[PDB]
Amino acid sequence: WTATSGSCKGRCFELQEVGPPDCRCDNLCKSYSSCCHDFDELCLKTARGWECTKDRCGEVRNEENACHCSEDCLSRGDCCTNYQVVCKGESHWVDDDCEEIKVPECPAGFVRPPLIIFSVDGFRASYMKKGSKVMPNIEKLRSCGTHAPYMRPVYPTKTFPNLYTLATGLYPESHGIVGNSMYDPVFDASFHLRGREKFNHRWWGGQPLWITATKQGVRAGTFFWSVSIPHERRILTILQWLSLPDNERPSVYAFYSEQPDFSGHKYGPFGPEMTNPLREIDKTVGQLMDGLKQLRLHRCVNVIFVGDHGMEDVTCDRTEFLSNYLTNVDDITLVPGTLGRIRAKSINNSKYDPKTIIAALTCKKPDQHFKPYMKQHLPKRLHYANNRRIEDIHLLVDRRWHVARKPLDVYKKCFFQGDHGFDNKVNSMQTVFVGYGPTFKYRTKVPPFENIELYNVMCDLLGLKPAPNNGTHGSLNHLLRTNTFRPTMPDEVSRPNYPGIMYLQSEFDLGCTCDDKVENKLEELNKRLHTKGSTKERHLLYGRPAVLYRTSYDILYHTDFESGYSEIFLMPLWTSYTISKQAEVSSIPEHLTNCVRPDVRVSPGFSQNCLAYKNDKQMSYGFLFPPYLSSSPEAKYDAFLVTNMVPMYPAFKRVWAYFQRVLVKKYASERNGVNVISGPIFDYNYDGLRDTEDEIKQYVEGSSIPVPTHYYSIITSCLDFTQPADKCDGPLSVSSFILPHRPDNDESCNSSEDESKWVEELMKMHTARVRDIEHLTGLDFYRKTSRSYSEILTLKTYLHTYESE
Numbered sequence: 098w099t100a101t102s103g104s105c106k107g108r109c110f111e112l113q114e115v116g117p118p119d120c121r122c123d124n125l126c127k128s129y130s131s132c133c134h135d136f137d138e139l140c141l142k143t144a145r146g147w148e149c150t151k152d153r154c155g156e157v158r159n160e161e162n163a164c165h166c167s168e169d170c171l172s173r174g175d176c177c178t179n180y181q182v183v184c185k186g187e188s189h190w191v192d193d194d195c196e197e198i199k200v201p202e203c204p205a206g207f208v209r210p211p212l213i214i215f216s217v218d219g220f221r222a223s224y225m226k227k228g229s230k231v232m233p234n235i236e237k238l239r240s241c242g243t244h245a246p247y248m249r250p251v252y253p254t255k256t257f258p259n260l261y262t263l264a265t266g267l268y269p270e271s272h273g274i275v276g277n278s279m280y281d282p283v284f285d286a287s288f289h290l291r292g293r294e295k296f297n298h299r300w301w302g303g304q305p306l307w308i309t310a311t312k313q314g315v316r317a318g319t320f321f322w323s324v325s326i327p328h329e330r331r332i333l334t335i336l337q338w339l340s341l342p343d344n345e346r347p348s349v350y351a352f353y354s355e356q357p358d359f360s361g362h363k364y365g366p367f368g369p370e371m372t373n374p375l376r377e378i379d380k381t382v383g384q385l386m387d388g389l390k391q392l393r394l395h396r397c398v399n400v401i402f403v404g405d406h407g408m409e410d411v412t413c414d415r416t417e418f419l420s421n422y423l424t425n426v427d428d429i430t431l432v433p434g435t436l437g438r439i440r441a442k443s444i445n446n447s448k449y450d451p452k453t454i455i456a457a458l459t460c461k462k463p464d465q466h467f468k469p470y471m472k473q474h475l476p477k478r479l480h481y482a483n484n485r486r487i488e489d490i491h492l493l494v495d496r497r498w499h500v501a502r503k504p505l506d507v508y509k510k511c512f513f514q515g516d517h518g519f520d521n522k523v524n525s526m527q528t529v530f531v532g533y534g535p536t537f538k539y540r541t542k543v544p545p546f547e548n549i550e551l552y553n554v555m556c557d558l559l560g561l562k563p564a565p566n567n568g569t570h571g572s573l574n575h576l577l578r579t580n581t582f583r584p585t586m587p588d589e590v591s592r593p594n595y596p597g598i599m600y601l602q603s604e605f606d607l608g609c610t611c612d613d614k615v616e617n618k619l620e621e622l623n624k625r626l627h628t629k630g631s632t633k634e635r636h637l638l639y640g641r642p643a644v645l646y647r648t649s650y651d652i653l654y655h656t657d658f659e660s661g662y663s664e665i666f667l668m669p670l671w672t673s674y675t676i677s678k679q680a681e682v683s684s685i686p687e688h689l690t691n692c693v694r695p696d697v698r699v700s701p702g703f704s705q706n707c708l709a710y711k712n713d714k715q716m717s718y719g720f721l722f723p724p725y726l727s728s729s730p731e732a733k734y735d736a737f738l739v740t741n742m743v744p745m746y747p748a749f750k751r752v753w754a755y756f757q758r759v760l761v762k763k764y765a766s767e768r769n770g771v772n773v774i775s776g777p778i779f780d781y782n783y784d785g786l787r788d789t790e791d792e793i794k795q796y797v798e799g800s801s802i803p804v805p806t807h808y809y810s811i812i813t814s815c816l817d818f819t820q821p822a823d824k825c826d827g828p829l830s831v832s833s834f835i836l837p838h839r840p841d842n843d844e845s846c847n848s849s850e851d852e853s854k855w856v857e858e859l860m861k862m863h864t865a866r867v868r869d870i871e872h873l874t875g876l877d878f879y880r881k882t883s884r885s886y887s888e889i890l891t892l893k894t895y896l897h898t899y900e901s902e
């Protein structure tokens with residue numbers, strides 16, 4: 098119930114929301130069917146439109162007008178945005194030369210530069226170049242301020258998940274908005290685009306910026322706008338708020354545009370109908386900037402121009418139907434379109450089996466345009482699993498396609514030519530970022546970055562302490578002139594042991610054998626030196642990783658590699674080695690094919706054993722430092738140490754052996770040497786965080802040897818590839834992966850072929866940031882470089898995406 102008989106007189110666009118049954122006058126009252134009777138008349142005036150004309154200048158105030166051109170309008174804060182241009186001979190902001198804003202130039206009474214966040218739905222990154230002729234205001238913000246060539250959204254590349262990530266700095270799995278449509282089985286409730294359930298606060302987790310601000314005594318404009326409030330009125334409301342007295346005036350504001358997304362769905366991302374919507378958004382930006390200039394705020398406010406996601410060409414004919422794969426199609430519920438999410442239609446159906454659904458959807462048609470996954474097997478870079486609202490079964494849909502349950506769903510609902518939602522590394526889904534103002538840098542291009550990073554920067558711009566989030570605070574310091582956040586490296590929690598030779602060969606009863614019984618003072622001191630770390634500077638280039646949790650581990654040195662060996666997990670946490678451009682690849686000699694050697698530095702009780710692998714008929718083993726890249730025949734024996742062995746399914750060893758025997762050398766050739774850090778990851782509860790021992794669901798049969806869920810590599814080299822990886826004076830270049838440790842290669846439809854036709858494609862799909870590996874391992878990398886810590890944080894957030902330009 099709403100008592101709509103109250104009045105909006107003196108309350109239009111009031112900041113504090115009043116509670117039912119009282120009638121509302123705030124910018125969302127329309128959306129709740131709750132505005133007072135006179136809200137349109139008083140608060141949505143349209144008379145005479147949005148622009149001053151010559152003949153209105155100096156008019157007698159008529160309060161019915163949408164905006165004013167009377168002499169008192171600046172003092173009232175309600176001039177049309179072009180007033181000073183039309184009536185006082187001023188220039189539009191866009192027509193003024195770019196001049197560096199070295200310090201905030203603010204009116205008296207402003208405690209800090211306000212922040213205005215201008216968000217555009219479906220604004221694809223390439224619009225900045227392709228639409229540049231029709232967007233002069235936005236182009237000036239971009240060229241004069243700080244910009245990235247594109248900003249990476251979160252998956253799924255839908256509106257509400259991305260807007261709420263922008264608001265919180267959280268992955269969707271953490272903030273809870275995991276799609277535009279959702280079912281929560283605990284609540285037994287559904288979230289939809291249409292209707293009232295989506296306003297219930299229980300959907301919305303984390304702490305969005307407007308709450309962070311309010312908690313810390315920074316006032317916020319209302320961030321949301323009912324669809325029928327026209328853009329010109331939204332801008333005028335912002336500008337009116339900015340004339341409030343100091344103690345009532347917000348410091349942070351948000352404007353949201355439904356365009357260009359609305360037209361892009363109808364016309365495709367580059368339909369000829371798209372020029373007008375881009376022009377219209379640019380005009381709105383011009384209104385805001387002119388309005389700020391009238392208020393003498395144009396060199397005071399920080400403006401962010403940001404998109405949620407891009408837009409791809411997608412038509413009704415490019416739809417795959419689950420009815421062409423499944424016999425049982427009426428027993429499932431599908432969330433459809435540019436991603437798929439599948440669950441049982443009835444919880445009372447005991448004949449529901451995810452395993453048979455997955456199998457029926459795997460590599461069934463030669464050109465199949467989606468791939469099924471159990472959510473825990475999705476690429477870890479998506480961070481799309483740890484929420485009860487994400488269904489166990491997921492379909493990753495190819496760009497340009499949809500998935501639907503049955504054909505009747507597509508025509509009892511062609512209309513559309515554009516859509517979005519796909520994998521957040523897809524070029525068409527990339528969006529935009531521009532920052533302009535005193536706190537942003539001047540005429541500065543920054544590398545592409547992820548939208549999860551922006552909440553921290555928005556907090557930095559407002560003097561707020563961010564709530565705990567998934568950004569890496571400091572990684573975006575290079576965007577800012579001032580207000581940078583200067584973090585310290587985390588403290589190492591566990592110090593390593595440095596064991597020497599402590600065990601005789603016969604103390605080991607591991608069931609391992611090696612043909613290594615082959616016997617010199619010249620070369621005897623040299624092998625002693627290698628075991629004490631004489632080559633460590635070559636193979637450990639950026640210092641040892643720090644262990645950020647409590648555990649027992651040993652540093653082990655070798656001629657060709659160094660490792661941190663966990664006495665708890667019985668295997669290395671990390672293995673570090675350097676491969677020069679000139680390194681040679683060699684075979685595993687015939688006589689050493691099954692060689693595994695006890696390590697006389699590590700007790701039998703803290704070692705793996707070969708008998709377990711013999712008895713486990715599903716599990717085999719691999720090595721972290723590759724025997725193929727040994728520096729010499731003698732050094733090769735180190736690679737067969739029991740301390741370098743890790744459990745590997747045979748199906749995964751195909752992947753791993755190709756990476757080690759072929760790809761590492763390829764990268765060293767291309768990059769002028771590489772440094773590799775490889776290791777295991779355990780994430781059985783798919784939370785993106787290192788498992789404790791008591792979370793491990795699988796061991797090598799009969800043993801305490803834990804089975805990794807994934808294997809990582811971090812591959813570092815010199816950004817200036819004229820310098821070798823091991824003598825690099827400047828910035829670094831990195832690519833990383835987190836490969837799923839799976840007992841089959843069902844993910845790779847072409848896996849019956851030679852590894853050269855499918856393995857690198859798998860690895861590209863599972864590309865990762867160093868920071869992703871940090872979360873999954875409790876390790877901190879790059880602790881000892883010549884580089885600034887903020888630059889290192891930026892490096893750790895880098896993702897190598899493998900898309901063209």
Ligand SMILES: *[C@@H]1O[C@H](CO)[C@@H](O[C@@H]2O[C@H](CO)[C@@H](O[C@@H]3O[C@H](CO[C@H]4O[C@H](CO)[C@@H](O)[C@H](O[C@H]5O[C@H](CO)[C@@H](O)[C@H](O)[C@@H]5O[C@H]5O[C@H](CO)[C@@H](O)[C@H](O)[C@@H]5O)[C@@H]4O)[C@@H](O)[C@H](O[C@H]4O[C@H](CO)[C@@H](O)[C@H](O)[C@@H]4O[C@H]4O[C@H](CO)[C@@H](O)[C@H](O)[C@@H]4O)[C@@H]3O)[C@H](O)[C@H]2NC(C)=O)[C@H](O)[C@H]1NC(C)=O
Nearest residue numbers: 270271272273301302303483484485565566567784785872
């Ligand atoms: C990305 O960044 C985020 C933010 O930093 C990271 O997420 C954090 O990670 C922590 C570890 O997973 C986690 O800490 C736990 O919090 C528990 C209390 O949580 C409530 O309070 C906070 C603070 O206000 C609130 O934000 C939480 O919000 C979640 O839940 C509500 C719904 O209830 C959602 O609306 C919201 O979206 C959010 O959901 C997300 O997180 C939860 C987990 O909290 C997931 O389950 C959801 O799927 C979703 O992803 C909560 O309202 C706290 O009680 C925990 O303590 C347990 O573990 C400790 C170990 O230190 C142990 O000492 C205790 O014994 C305790 O265990 C007991 O409970 C167990 C479970 O019932 C039980 O099994 C045991 O036997 C014990 O009885 C714990 O400290 C933190 O909550 C989240 N925060 C957020 C916002 O998500 C995220 O990790 C980052 N991701 C990456 C990849 O880096």
Ligand SMILES: O=C(c1cc(OCC2CCOCC2)nc(C2CC2)c1)N1CC2=C(C1)CN(C(=O)N1CCn3c(n[nH]c3=O)C1)C2
Nearest residue numbers: 214216218256257260261263264290320321322351353358
């Ligand atoms: O006002 C907001 C808004 C604005 C908003 O800013 C958060 C800011 C935080 C800081 O960084 C800048 C962003 N945050 C929210 C939610 C997340 C808290 C909401 N609205 C969004 C939408 C509205 C109005 C209507 N609409 C819609 O019907 N479609 C649903 C269907 N859909 C759409 N486009 N394409 C498509 O499929 C959009 C989407």
Ligand SMILES: [Ca+2]
Nearest residue numbers: 780786787788
């Ligand atoms: Ca985990």
Ligand SMILES: [Cl-]
Nearest residue numbers: 255276277278
């Ligand atoms: Cl969705």
Ligand SMILES: [K+]
Nearest residue numbers: 710713716717
């Ligand atoms: K075996």
Ligand code: NA
Nearest residue numbers: 842843845848
């Ligand atoms: Na296969």
Ligand SMILES: [Zn+2]
Nearest residue numbers: 219358362517
């Ligand atoms: Zn859309």
